[PDB]
Amino acid sequence: VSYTIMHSEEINKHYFDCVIKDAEMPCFLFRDLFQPFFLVQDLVTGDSGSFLGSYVLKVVGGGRTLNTIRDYTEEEIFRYNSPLDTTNSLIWKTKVERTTEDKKFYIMSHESPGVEWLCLENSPCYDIIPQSIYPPEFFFKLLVSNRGVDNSTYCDYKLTFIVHIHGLPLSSKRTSFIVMVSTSFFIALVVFYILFCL
Amino acid sequence: SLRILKLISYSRGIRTLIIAVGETVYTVASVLTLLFLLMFVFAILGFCLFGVTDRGDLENWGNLASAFFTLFSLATVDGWTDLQEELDKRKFTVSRAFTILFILLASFIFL
């Protein structure tokens, strides 16, 4: 968490949390580029070293608020993470060349450029209207694995956690709808003004 | 060079030019005195603002001669950027406003 905060500060020259600050929970910015770091700690020892290698990341669920998240099926994760899916369901896309076996999911390391978040039209980013003030916030539950990208571990450190995001601008129609309804209502009012002024 | 000045003491045309520009001596002396008064005012002001606290910014608003030279530079256009970068780190946010006010009075009025 702290390495993520200071790396975002160094790269983006800023890092904005939520309006309600949380000590354990940091609110990552959608505009800020995300570069994940992970570490293996051996809690029975006095050792905790960073994960200097490759790891597999894939979003397995999304939620608007607390306990509003659900896990996603295998085909759902294939739609949302695999670049082979021609359907516009990808949540993120990283300009990297390394890919796992069967070319299913991208493989990224500690030297990777970063994570660029998209969450296209099939993602739940589209058709989002928060019920109150401030930009809507979202949580993404996801797992990081080392199942088939390890040459030095006898088992994978499959860790499931949650990533926060805020500031979600993903859609289109709504803008067109409000634009045409404003134009129609205002031209109706102006035409009424003209006719009643005559 | 004083001997060369004695050489150029000739040339009656330059003498007529000197006569024609010689009535502005009192005026330029008055403008110089107003300039010096403004340097003294902002010299005591810059000293009181940055050198009495004695937490840095020495030999810029500290000693009298160095302070005077820095004020003359700030009244000119030269050195203002590096002087501002020197003064903004001394936990004095309104020093930037004071210095830009000093520029927009002194430089414009004098020139």
């Binding site: 968490v1 702290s2 354990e24 570490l39 700690q41 905790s48 860790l159 956690f161 949650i162 | -």
Partner: protein, 49 residues
């Protein structure tokens, strides 16, 4: 059984994390205890737990 949370945290030390603000009152509670005035003569220290 509780430190299985999925976040990294600072240096792990759950006793230190729950101590937190009370780590700066060691000699404070020691003086309150030594004169036999604080509570029922009960003293709880750092390294015991």
């Amino acid at each position: 059984s509780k430190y299985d949370k999925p976040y990294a945290d600072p240096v792990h030390d759950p006793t230190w994390r729950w101590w937190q603000h009370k780590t700066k009152d060691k000699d404070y509670f020691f003086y309150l205890f030594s004169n036999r005035l604080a509570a029922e003569g009960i003293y709880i220290n750092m390294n015991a737990y």
